[PDB]
Paper text:
We then performed subtomogram averaging and classification, yielding three well-defined states of the intact V-[name] at approximately 17 Å resolution corresponding to about 120° rotations of the rotor subcomplex between the states. To achieve higher-resolution maps and resolve the binding partner better, we collected a large set of cryo-electron microscopy (cryo-EM) projection images and performed single-particle cryo-EM analysis (SPA) of the V-[name]. Refinements resulted in maps of the intact V-[name] assembly, again consisting of three states all at 4.3 Å resolution and a map of the V0-only V-[name] assembly at 3.8 Å resolution. Unexpectedly, the cryo-ET reconstructions and SPA maps revealed that [name] is bound to the synaptic vesicle V-[name]. Moreover, further supporting our findings, the V0 domain of the synaptic vesicle V-[name] was associated with [name] in synaptosome preparations. Together, [name] is the most likely candidate for the binding partner to the synaptic vesicle V-ATPases that we discovered in our in situ cryo-ET and single-particle cryo-EM studies of ISVs. Starting with published V-[name] structures and the AlphaFold2-predicted [name] model, we refined atomic models of both the intact and the V0-only V-[name] assemblies in complex with [name] using the wild-type ISV SPA average maps. The luminal parts of subunit e2 and subunit a form an interface with [name], and electrostatic interactions are involved in this interface. The interaction is identical for both intact and V0-only V-[name] assemblies, suggesting that this interaction does not appear to directly regulate the hydrolysis mechanism of the V-[name]. Comparison of the structures shows that the V-[name] structure is not substantially affected by the interaction with [name]. The confined membrane environment of a synaptic vesicle, including vesicle curvature, probably contributes to stabilizing the relatively small V-[name]–[name] interface.
Author numbering:
A (entry chain f): 5 to 90
B (entry chain a): 389 to 634
C (entry chain d): 3 to 352
D (entry chain c): 413 to 451
E (entry chain g), F (entry chain h), G (entry chain i), I (entry chain o), J (entry chain n), K (entry chain m): 6 to 155
H (entry chain j): 105 to 155
L (entry chain l): 53 to 104
M (entry chain p): 599 to 641
Write the structure that this text describes.
Amino acid sequence: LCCGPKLAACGIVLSAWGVIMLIMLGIFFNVHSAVLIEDVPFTEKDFENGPQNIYNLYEQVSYNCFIAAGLYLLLGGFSFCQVRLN
Amino acid sequence: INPAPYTVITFPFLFAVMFGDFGHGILMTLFAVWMVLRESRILSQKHENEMFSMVFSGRYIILLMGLFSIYTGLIYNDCFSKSLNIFGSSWSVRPMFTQGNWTEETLLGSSVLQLNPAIPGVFGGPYPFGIDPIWNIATNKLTFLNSFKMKMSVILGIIHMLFGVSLSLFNHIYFKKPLNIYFGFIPEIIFMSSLFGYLVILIFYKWTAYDAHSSRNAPSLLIHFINMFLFSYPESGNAMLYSGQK
Amino acid sequence: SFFPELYFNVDNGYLEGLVRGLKAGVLSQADYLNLVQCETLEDLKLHLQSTDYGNFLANEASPLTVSVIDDKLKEKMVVEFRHMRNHAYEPLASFLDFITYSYMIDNVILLITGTLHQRSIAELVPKCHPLGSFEQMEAVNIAQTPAELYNAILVDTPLAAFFQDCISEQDLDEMNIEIIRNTLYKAYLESFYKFCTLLGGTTADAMCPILEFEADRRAFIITINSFGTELSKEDRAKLFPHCGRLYPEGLAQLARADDYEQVKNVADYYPEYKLLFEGAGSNPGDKTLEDRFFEHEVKLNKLAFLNQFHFGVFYAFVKLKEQECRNIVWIAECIAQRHRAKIDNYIPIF
Amino acid sequence: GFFSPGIWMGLLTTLFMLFIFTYGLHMILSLKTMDRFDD
Amino acid sequence: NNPEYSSFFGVMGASSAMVFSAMGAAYGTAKSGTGIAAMSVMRPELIMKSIIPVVMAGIIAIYGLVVAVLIANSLTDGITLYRSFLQLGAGLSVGLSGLAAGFAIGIVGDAGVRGTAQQPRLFVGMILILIFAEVLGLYGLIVALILSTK
Amino acid sequence: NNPEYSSFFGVMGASSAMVFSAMGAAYGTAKSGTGIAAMSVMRPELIMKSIIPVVMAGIIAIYGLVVAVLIANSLTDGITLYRSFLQLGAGLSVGLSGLAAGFAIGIVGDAGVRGTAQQPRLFVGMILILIFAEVLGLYGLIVALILSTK
Amino acid sequence: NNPEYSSFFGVMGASSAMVFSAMGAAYGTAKSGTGIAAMSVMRPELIMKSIIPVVMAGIIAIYGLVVAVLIANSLTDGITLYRSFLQLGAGLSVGLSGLAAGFAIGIVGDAGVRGTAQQPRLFVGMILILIFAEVLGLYGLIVALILSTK
Amino acid sequence: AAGFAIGIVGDAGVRGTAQQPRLFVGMILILIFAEVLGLYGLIVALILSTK
Amino acid sequence: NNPEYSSFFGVMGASSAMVFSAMGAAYGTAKSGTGIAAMSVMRPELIMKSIIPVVMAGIIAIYGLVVAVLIANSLTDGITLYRSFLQLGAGLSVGLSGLAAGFAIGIVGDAGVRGTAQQPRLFVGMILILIFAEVLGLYGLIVALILSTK
Amino acid sequence: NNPEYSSFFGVMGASSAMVFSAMGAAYGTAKSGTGIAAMSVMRPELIMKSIIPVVMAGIIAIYGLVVAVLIANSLTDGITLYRSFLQLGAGLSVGLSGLAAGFAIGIVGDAGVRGTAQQPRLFVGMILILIFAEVLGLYGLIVALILSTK
Amino acid sequence: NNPEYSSFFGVMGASSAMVFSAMGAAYGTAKSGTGIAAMSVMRPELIMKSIIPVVMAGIIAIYGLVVAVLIANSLTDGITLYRSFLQLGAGLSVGLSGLAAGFAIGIVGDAGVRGTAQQPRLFVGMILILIFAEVLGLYGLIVALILSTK
Amino acid sequence: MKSIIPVVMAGIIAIYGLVVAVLIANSLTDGITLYRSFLQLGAGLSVGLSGL
Amino acid sequence: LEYSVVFNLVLWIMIGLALAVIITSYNIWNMDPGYDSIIYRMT
Amino acid sequence: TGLELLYLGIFVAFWACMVVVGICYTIFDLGFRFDVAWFLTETSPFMWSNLGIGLAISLSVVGAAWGIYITGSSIIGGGVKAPRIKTKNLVSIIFCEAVAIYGIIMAIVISNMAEPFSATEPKAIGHRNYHAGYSMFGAGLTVGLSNLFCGVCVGIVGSGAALADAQNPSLFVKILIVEIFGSAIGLFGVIVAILQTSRVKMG
Amino acid sequence: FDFGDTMVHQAIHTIEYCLGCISNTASYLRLWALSLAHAQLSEVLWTMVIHIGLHVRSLAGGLGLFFIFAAFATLTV
């Protein structure tokens, strides 16, 4: 019926692969604390006191993957719902 | 000699080394297996897309190709422009580099970089987990990877050529044609074995022989090869790679 | 285009305006309804006098005939073409020289075998088709010598360059006159195509497709026709013009062709002229295949008229005016014959 | 330097003028005659 | 005290004026002369009225001596480097303006003589075009006279 | 206050003057000569009326040559470089005006020769244009001499 | 003291005279000779009369030699920079004037032999044009001489 | 220039002589004129080689 | 401070901005201006629909206006030679973008007007390609706007 | 330490960047539009499909703009001597890459449009070629951006 | 204290290398597209086979890509001024060698186009001669990178 | 298949420039003597255009 | 010494020579000998 | 096409010499020898004022000449069989004359601001003289080229309309409006040139 | 027994065989070129598109990462 599978299978694949690699990336940002070999970029301009606030930033940036993964899962659920409309 | 049993393998690996990427290989195999699952479905299915027909007709190629591509990406430690941190890096620590007559140049390092000269005395050595990830950060990684990849590509090509040419012997013996052996195959193997196996042993010997301590006055394989090819041998100014090689 | 306008208009404004106006000078369709509605030759004179044409039957035979209608149409055509060609300039003058060289070779093949046979040359003069000119000498009063005309026509007549292929004086007797005319038509046609391509402007753009169409159509019709004659397929491919889409592909299948269906398939390789095939009704009171070919010519003539910075407009006017004369004399023919069930073999142009 | 600027002014300006006149000459020679008249 | 070459520029002003005038006039005579020379086999009666393009070309000619003599008799060696460049620019401008006028006029003359050869009706409009060409030349002249002393 | 190299301007003026005179004369003569050669085939009596352009090409040669000798008359090493300016400018200028003239003459002659083939009365129009454009030759020569003496 | 190259502009005058004279004589000879060999086919009995244009091609080359040898005789190490410019202008002048004369001679000679191939009476007009061409050549000669000795 | 004129007049004259053998003499003379031009060139060349 | 006569580059930038738009818009109103007239005889009912490219070429000229008047408004005596470069680049950029747009508009418009003359229903798609041409012109304008306000 | 006015190089860089892209876009548009304008009569159902190449030209125009605005964002007289000519090189790079893309896209559009006019299925291969032209444009952007930020 | 204007022997080298790659590849696609439009009207079974030269239209872009970004990464604030000349060399070297290769690839594409119209077997020879072309581009890459590392 | 031999000779023209380019790369350095670099220029030009 | 105007003089002479030699080369390469009415006998 | 090909030959030769000297500039350590500031400081605004006036009149005149011929010959060729054409189509010639008039108005406006200087020192002398001269030849270039383009466009479109009149004279009603756009191009050049002269003076 | 033709046959075969062996050993370096290609395009597209994931945003970082992510995903495939 509405929004058949022929054009929602792409959404399904994209959502699944996206949740996969963002959970991997969040895991590598909070547990590895985004080691620089894997993630050079960092948002500070003054770190001459110590590495602690850089760690706090590492948790801050790894926090950004939870919203990502969660609403991709929402999009995947909605895509499955569109697919079930037969 | 049917060449199917040899292409069936070597074509995969050569694509894989020409396609040295981990996650891209993963995606290719994912799509390949997706086709594998619905084989009997598509066989009883009518379509007009003819590129699609040529590809599911050759799915046996692409699946194995993708497996080897994933494996090659595992070699190069390049999964989407990044390397997995096994943390086997064995290059630098605080007290060592400060013990190399150095301190607090990072105060000036806000504007400069200060490459470290090699031979610290304690660092180096092999990295069993492939390419050491530290290179991914260094902006001089181009020289390292260029020399590396160029040399291994040349050697792989030499090996493939030398192996592949040998099937003419099977041809010559099966058809009782040693006439193609006498004034043929034998001098062929002679010139190729010399001209390329010599280079192979040269690079192996250089890699096994010289260290960064002897970097000064260290020749290059290029200059030796061109000197040999050109009949030109200077009387001095360039030390041999080994005694008596002239 | 890129070069013209700034340079076209300077020396083509008059001729562009002239071809437009003389397209407008053809008989209106209301005039045509007057033509069909009288069904009499005296009234035919009466109302052709009232249109652009006519008022030319002065000093003519009181029993108006169809041949007089043909002569007056052809006199209007040759008068208009002497008007256009008189005012011209080396490129376009040369173009119109090409437009005339087809009829030149036609009339020249009329002249030949009037002197291999023991016939007068003054006899030949009044019978030449118009535009023939032939004000050049060494070809008249030749004392019935093949070599004299051979040298006369290699030396003096302007189209001598094409006769470099027709040489040795042997083909005059051993070979057919018609085949010679065909070789000359081919060689001239390809030379004309090369000249067009040299002038690489919208002239080339508008004249390439119509020359390819003419080559393709003539190969098409000739291949249809020679299924009842003595000609082999390699001597056949010898005389098909090179300047056609067929030479890439389609000429080979025509060489392989032996009947109506292989040539039908040849038409089917190209949708543009397949449509011209299925219009070959050939019904008594309708049009035939040749008429559909002339119709496609008319469509391409209109397409040439749409563009305005090239030279195919004049060729378009050629083909349209020939069709128009064919229509008017045909109407006169069916008026004299009194057979109104069969007036329908003419194609209105505008 | 490597020239005399004093007359280099006139040189460059006159070259511009002669380039405009070169366009003018390309157009003035773009003329070319006609063939016979129509009667 | 003045910078050198001062008179040289005025001499070029005169030369430029007269050259471009002569080019335009020669163009006019060339094209009109071909038209008249070849057309009059069939309508000889138009020969005595085709002089109009000829004298129109002559008038395009004439714009030379006025400016050229204005240069020639008024040119000296003690110039402040300001006058001489003005005469250079003025001579160039008026000259090639006359060149363009002749570029129009000769070809207008040939097209016109053929047009009147067919039928005498178009002659008045043809001469109308010619007089507008002379007006163009006169525009060039008046700006030359402006720059003569400005 | 006379910069050196002053003889250069005068010599190049006289040179270029007769150079361009020779060019224009060659154009006119060559065109008219081909015309008269291909014409006297069928009417020899037209020679007396087709040779006036040759005379007037000679007149252009005389123009260039009087200019050349006149400029040569006032030439030396240490010229003021203020008269040589006029010499150079005028010498180029009149000669190339002569180019324009004689080129137009030759074109009109090419047309008029064929024009007078079957209709003898076109001699009047031929001469009408022919004197006119050579009066334009004189037109240029006037400024030539005025500057040569200025 | 003496500016550089001051004894060498005459050398290039002689060179240019020879250059343009050689080009001219060669072109005229080629052009006339083509028509001469053409009309020898059907009228070999007028070849001697048709040698005449080539003879004057030789003569105008002699004009070029008169200038060249005089300039060669009027050269030395210590020139005062103005006779050198004089001979430069003289040589290029005469050379190219002979060039244009040879152009006209050649093409009119081809046309004239074409025309006279049916009527030897046209020789008179052919000679008329022909002689006038060397009159032009002589004028170039005269100016070259006066400049070379000025 | 000499070779240019020599080649053209020679081609024309040898083509013309391909019909009439008489032309040979006149053709050669027309060439002689251009070789006289060559003579001139060498004369001035000698002058400047000994000046 | 502001160096000497710092305004120059902007003084030329405004000129380039307007004059290259004068090339583009002139070509645009030329091509369709002639093609529409050619079409009008057969069927006049689509004439105002076919006029659409011409006014759009006018819009290209208007783009030229906006850039030129911006440059002139910012034009002063105290120029830093930074904004002068900005104005020069802006003017050149917008002008030549208008040139490219004018060429595309002219050719596509002639092809489109004859194509619609043959078949009515193609008009809107013709206008689509024409709209694209203006999109390119708009990109030219916005680049010049960025430079005029930097 | 930095030579003054290195920002001029970036100005001309942004200019050239959008310049050559606009050239390519106009080249593609002219050809594609003229191609459709003929054949939409005979295959009107391909009118919808014909938009695919022209928007590709539009992507080229977009690329010109994005590089221009990037350089505008990075433009300043306070450049370290090592960043403005980077803008120049990248601008030239990407602009002429857009030019080459326009060349290829226009001509391939002409070939493929009649290709599909004969046979509808050829569309897929045609689109493949268009994809490739865009891939070329993308590489141009890649290197351009690398130089832009470094 | 390295010389000023040093890094641009790198910037322009990279730009030029990819410039000529962009030219060469686009010409390859040019001829390939015309050829495939020619073939596929009559031989649909050869469409995807004739797409093969199209993939090698892109390798010219790949080689220049490699060299360009190598030069980009190797560029620095201050250079030793011995590597940047190598970059200029290598860039021009590979770029123009690849442009020549692209010419060859397009035209041999046309050759195999005209080849396989009658005989599909020629596909193999087409590809063979096609391999003979890109070896030059790879050769250029060889020497270019030898210089980039010398 | 037997008409590939001229193309083989073209490939030989290809190997030529590579031979000379490698020679130049060998004899190249940073501070060249200033009288070998023009020799490299002329050598490259000569061999390359002879290949042409 | 005082090259600043003599080099301009040499430039003017050189361009004059170039113009002359170019005109002659154009007219000598593309000279138009008629080449008619007998060319067919030799072909 | 040989003559224009030799023209392109000298063009490419000039550019070749340009690149050669440009490279050799930095090869042999030429120390800012092409001092652009020296060039600008050493030039004069006499060139610039006279260039402005002369180019304005020059290019306006030749553009008007183009329009005059194209319209005139189209009209008289069309009138051979349809003499009614001129009675409505001769106005195009008046229009191109008006283009020339606009150009001349700009010429006098530019002549409003020409004067001698007769000064020797460049430094701090005639600072606004340069500015005003730059404005002047800018205005001349703009006006002249704009008038060229109006002229060519008007001429060719006028010819098209003139011979479209031959078949149906009622079409002249809905075709003459094309000239208005080119007139807008002329009046645009006028506006920009006025702004160019609005805020300039020699000092 | 055509001695000359077979001699030339073997001569051309040996010449092409040796020279082709050399050119083929040279041509194997396309592997190196392509490997460089894969590497270089990977890190450059990373540093272009997905590198923008870094930003000081504390709440809308991931939210914009949505369309950034979809963008490079479709592009990279």
